[PDB]
């Protein structure tokens, strides 16, 4: 079965061209005579431009194929203009005209000058790799993809040794070892079918690693989670039910080790955990299961009276990094409670506890979020004392942060 037809250009386009040139009152047989001649020349060239596509070993007819197909038929590749003498440009392609259907048809002559030129790409180089090693294709990134019998483990001993080396490197005794092991996790294609043992090693580790608050052990495990996530080959949402309560524990937990000093890292432990938490709510999303569940736990962490301030700071960070609208709809009705908590830490003399440090970190983070939440939905008018209607927390310094954001927008 082949219902192949002969499609020509419409004749009602050929009369428009003729009467817009000075040739009026053309007959239909005169006009049909134009549209079978030019539709043959389009068919003659597109069949002849398909010879250059095949010879160049491409499957896409580029714009230069018609330039050589025209030159082959002794017609100038020039499309915009036609030179009767032909001496200024003799069968020289000018690369066509960059024109569109949805174009503006008028531009300003200094708009084209002030735009940045595109980056010239890298030159052609010759790299060698292996398609086949004695018959077997390697999984390198240059390649696409009555007694019952004594059973064998589903991992090989090379794979089991690889798992042991990667896990003993990912506990961060040496930093270059970690970084390679993290890149190895980030791009091994065959890291599926080992992923249960990695997820179990992460989950089990954080839970017996918060019994004594060992910050590096945790910072290395969170980097292992981040290296597990950006791997494109492996299927993760079968294992995310173990991954998510591990990161929530890094963010919402108390620190058993020295309270101050590494709290700077503790903020990053809560910074790395809140980053991977909102990346996990970005992926793996179905209706009303993952993002709303962690949002509900973060909000009941917040509205809980008389919290640990480490847990308070971590939950504050976690609710803060959830995106544009989440701080637009959630952080709004709670400024008075935040201010009252800050006032209590300030009044009580107790300085040797961690309450004061927790309060300062929470207030700074909340004030930065409130700044763009404001820069985003209102003009920057009355930036001096109008914020005193919102208990005067960040005030003019918040206004200065908004001004810095406006300067960054101007630079963009």
């Amino acid at each position: 079965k082949l219902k192949l037809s002969n499609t020509v250009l419409p004749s009602e386009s050929m009369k428009v061209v003729a009467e817009s040139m000075g040739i009026a009152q053309i007959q239909e047989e005169t006009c049909q005579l134009l549209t079978d001649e030019v539709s043959y020349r389009i068919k003659e060239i597109a069949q002849d431009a398909l010879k250059f596509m095949h010879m160049g070993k491409r499957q896409k007819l580029t714009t230069s194929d018609i330039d050589y197909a025209l030159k082959l038929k002794n017609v100038e590749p020039l499309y915009g203009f036609h030179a009767q003498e032909f001496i200024p440009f003799r069968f020289a392609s000018g690369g066509g005209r960059e024109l569109y259907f949805y174009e503006e048809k008028e531009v300003d002559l200094s708009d084209i000058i002030n735009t940045p030129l595109p980056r010239v790409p890298l030159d052609v180089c010759l790299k060698a790799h292996w398609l086949s090693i004695e018959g077997c294709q390697p999984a390198i990134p240059e390649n696409p993809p009555r007694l019952k019998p004594r059973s064998i483990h589903e991992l090989s001993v090379e794979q089991q040794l690889y798992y042991k080396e990667i896990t003993e490197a990912c506990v961060g005794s040496c930093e270059a070892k970690r970084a390679e092991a993290l890149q190895s996790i980030a791009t091994d294609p065959g890291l599926y079918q080992m992923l249960p043992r990695f997820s179990t090693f992460i989950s089990e580790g954080v839970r017996v690693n918060v019994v004594q608050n060992n910050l590096a052990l945790l910072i290395y495990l969170m980097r292992m989670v981040k290296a597990l996530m950006d791997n494109p080959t492996l299927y993760l949402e079968k294992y995310v039910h173990e991954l998510i309560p591990a990161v929530m524990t890094c963010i919402v937990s108390r620190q058993l080790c020295l309270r101050p000093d590494v709290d700077n890292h503790w903020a990053l432990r809560d910074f790395a955990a809140r980053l991977v938490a909102q990346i996990c709510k970005h992926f793996s999303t179905t209706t009303n299961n993952i993002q709303s569940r962690i949002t509900k736990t973060f909000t009941k962490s917040w509205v809980d009276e008389k919290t640990p301030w480490t847990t308070r700071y971590g939950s504050i960070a976690g609710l803060a990094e959830l995106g544009h609208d989440v701080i637009k709809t959630l952080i709004l009705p709670r400024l008075q409670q935040e201010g009252e908590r800050i006032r209590s830490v300030l009044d009580g003399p107790v300085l040797s506890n961690i309450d004061r440090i927790g309060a300062d970190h929470v207030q700074s983070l909340l004030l930065k979020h409130c700044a763009p939440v404001l820069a985003k939905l209102r003009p920057p008018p009355d930036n001096q004392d109008a914020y005193r209607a919102e208990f005067g927390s960040l005030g003019p310094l918040l206004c200065s942060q908004v001004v810095k954001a406006r300067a960054q927008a101007a630079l963009q």
């Binding site: 390198i140 004594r150 064998i152 690889y162």
Partner: protein
């Protein structure tokens, strides 16, 4: 050669005469203790001590 080759592994076998004697001895002692306590509890019983 995680990329082109593979080989199987097995579970650690306990071929030690000491721990095999210990395992068989303790399992025999435990099953005979369980059997005699079950048969003394579900029948008529005596006692060396008063109400034992």
């Amino acid at each position: 050669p995680h990329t082109y080759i593979k080989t199987p592994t097995y579970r650690e076998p306990v071929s030690d005469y000491q721990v095999l004697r210990e395992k068989a001895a303790s399992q025999r002692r435990d099953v005979e203790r369980a059997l005699t306590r079950f048969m003394a509890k579900t029948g008529e019983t005596q006692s060396l001590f008063k109400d034992d």
